[PDB]
Amino acid sequence: GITFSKNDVEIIARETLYRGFFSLDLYRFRHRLFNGGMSGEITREIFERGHAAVLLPFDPVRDEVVLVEQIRIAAYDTSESPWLLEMVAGMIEAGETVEDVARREALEEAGLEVGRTKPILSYLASPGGTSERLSILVGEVDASTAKGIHGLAEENEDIRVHVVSREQAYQWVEEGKIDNAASVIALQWLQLHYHNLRNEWT
Amino acid sequence: QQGITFSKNDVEIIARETLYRGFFSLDLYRFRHRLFNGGMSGEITREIFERGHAAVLLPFDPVRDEVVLVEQIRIAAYDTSESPWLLEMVAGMIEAGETVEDVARREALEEAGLEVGRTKPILSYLASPGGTSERLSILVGEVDASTAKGIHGLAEENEDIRVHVVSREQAYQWVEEGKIDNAASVIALQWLQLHYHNLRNEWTK
Numbered sequence: 001g002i003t004f005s006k007n008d009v010e011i012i013a014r015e016t017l018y019r020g021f022f023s024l025d026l027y028r029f030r031h032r033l034f035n036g037g038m039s040g041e042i043t044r045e046i047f048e049r050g051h052a053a054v055l056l057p058f059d060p061v062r063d064e065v066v067l068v069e070q071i072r073i074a075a076y077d078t079s080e081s082p083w084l085l086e087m088v089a090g091m092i093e094a095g096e097t098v099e100d101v102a103r104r105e106a107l108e109e110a111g112l113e114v115g116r117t118k119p120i121l122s123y124l125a126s127p128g129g130t131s132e133r134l135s136i137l138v139g140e141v142d143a144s145t146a147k148g149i150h151g152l153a154e155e156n157e158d159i160r161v162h163v164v165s166r167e168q169a170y171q172w173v174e175e176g177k178i179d180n181a182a183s184v185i186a187l188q189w190l191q192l193h194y195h196n197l198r199n200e201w202t
Numbered sequence: 203q204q205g206i207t208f209s210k211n212d213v214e215i216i217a218r219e220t221l222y223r224g225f226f227s228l229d230l231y232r233f234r235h236r237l238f239n240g241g242m243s244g245e246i247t248r249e250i251f252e253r254g255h256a257a258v259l260l261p262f263d264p265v266r267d268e269v270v271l272v273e274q275i276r277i278a279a280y281d282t283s284e285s286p287w288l289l290e291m292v293a294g295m296i297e298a299g300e301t302v303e304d305v306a307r308r309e310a311l312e313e314a315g316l317e318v319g320r321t322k323p324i325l326s327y328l329a330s331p332g333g334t335s336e337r338l339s340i341l342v343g344e345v346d347a348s349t350a351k352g353i354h355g356l357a358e359e360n361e362d363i364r365v366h367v368v369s370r371e372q373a374y375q376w377v378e379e380g381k382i383d384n385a386a387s388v389i390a391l392q393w394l395q396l397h398y399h400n401l402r403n404e405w406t407k
């Protein structure tokens with residue numbers, strides 16, 4: 001496994017470079033080197049935007065997945081369209097749990113009640129430049145109740161529900177039609193675990 | 203089956219404003235877009251972290267069923283991880299005029315001392331598109347894991363990297379256990395777990 005621990009790094013200071021809806025911080029730190037020495041003082045720019053909960057809504061009876069479609073303008077420059085097919089997800093605020101956020105967002109974004117849940121994985125989105133961690137759950141849903149247009153208007157959130165079969169969703173990952181990290185991770189996990197999960201939940 | 207509903211013709215980007223520029227940038231996108239129930243939104247603003255785009259290389263030894271991991275500190279992991287040293291894929295930013303393949307091969311040498319044989323695309327993904335534009339394009343690369351050892355990275359860039367060789371099965375079990383938990387490695391190693399049988403047959407013929 002890894003070589004060094006938090007006993008091997010000192011964060012000297014963090015400087016807020018930008019404070020708005022999100023923050024950008026300069027971390028100043030020193031750390032042990034693999035060759036046996038200590039680094040000098042290093043600085044890194046880090047995008048601070050909190051952490052998120054992600055829900056894969058899976059119907060184990062029908063072998064169906066619920067996707068949500070919404071515009072993500074940051075996708076515009078490298079994608080055919082900025083509207084993406086994604087997992088239910090939202091930011092975790094102070095004192096909330098991953099699972100309570102997932103359930104609130106499943107209701108607000110897809111009109112879905114969630115039954116049983118299991119953790120998938122918790123991952124760092126891009127840890128060279130952002131602290132963001134996302135914790136994915138799979139949630140038992142009745143996909144026949146998933147339809148229509150959702151999202152909170154007062155937050156300029158406009159979301160369309162799509163229901164597909166599991167195999168169809170995974171085909172869309174293979175084809176590049178679904179290409180955001182949270183959805184790729186969740187649906188690859190589903191393809192590796194669906195036999196046991198469907199058995200557990202049926 | 204239809205898929206997504208709207209295209210770039212359905213969104214108007216009114217302006218972008220750089221709010222902060224240093225090594226990276228934070229931009230404010232100002233835009234309007236079509237609504238599903240009809241009509242156009244009002245003006246919306248989003249803060250977007252701009253850091254360019256990256257190439258990622260999963261170094262896979264098909265003879266040995268082994269993967270090469272690189273360990274380095276990622277200080278952004280500190281607040282949510284037991285240690286900021288992460289086990290990762292070879293990866294680097296893509297400079298203008300460069301291909302994903304060119305970057306992947308260069309970084310394999312710089313970060314792991316690895317010569318790469320054949321490559322195949324895995325997947326290209328958006329890291330976190332609600333708040334960053336970053337796209338990462340993953341290749342799998344054919345390597346001899348018996349050549350993978352030691353300390354690498356560019357010291358003049360304060361890049362200090364240690365090579366680890368593990369079995370594919372061990373690497374994937376570490377994803378399941380949360381010991382590997384950065385997106386690029388998770389995506390690449392899940393893909394490998396779904397495709398290694400055919401990939402080994404393809405590359406050992």
Ligand SMILES: Nc1ncnc2c1ncn2[C@@H]1O[C@H](COP(=O)(O)OP(=O)(O)OC[C@H]2O[C@H](O)[C@H](O)[C@@H]2O)[C@@H](O)[C@H]1O
Pocket residue numbers: 043044045046126127128129130225256293294295336338359360361
């Ligand atoms: N946050 C930072 N702030 C300042 N300088 C930095 C930073 N990150 C890197 N540098 C400088 O830039 C040099 C080279 O950075 P390269 O190695 O091509 O990129 P990558 O591997 O870091 O990022 C690639 C992906 O993997 C990661 O997970 C990222 O999140 C990306 O998603 C470093 O040695 C530093 O001097």
Ligand SMILES: Nc1ncnc2c1ncn2[C@@H]1O[C@H](COP(=O)(O)OP(=O)(O)OC[C@H]2O[C@H](O)[C@H](O)[C@@H]2O)[C@@H](O)[C@H]1O
Pocket residue numbers: 021052089090091132134155156157247248249250330331332333334
């Ligand atoms: N970039 C932004 N700039 C300004 N306001 C924003 C921004 N993003 C969201 N808001 C405001 O905050 C509201 C709620 O945004 P949240 O709870 O985070 O949900 P989510 O699904 O968007 O992001 C969750 C993850 O998925 C994505 O990939 C992200 O990268 C995350 O990783 C928006 O409707 C706006 O009012």
Ligand SMILES: [Mg+2]
Pocket residue numbers: 088089090105109
């Ligand atoms: Mg959301």
Ligand SMILES: [Mg+2]
Pocket residue numbers: 089090105108109157
């Ligand atoms: Mg929401």
Ligand SMILES: [Mg+2]
Pocket residue numbers: 292293294309313
């Ligand atoms: Mg790198």
Ligand SMILES: [Mg+2]
Pocket residue numbers: 293294309312313361
């Ligand atoms: Mg490098």
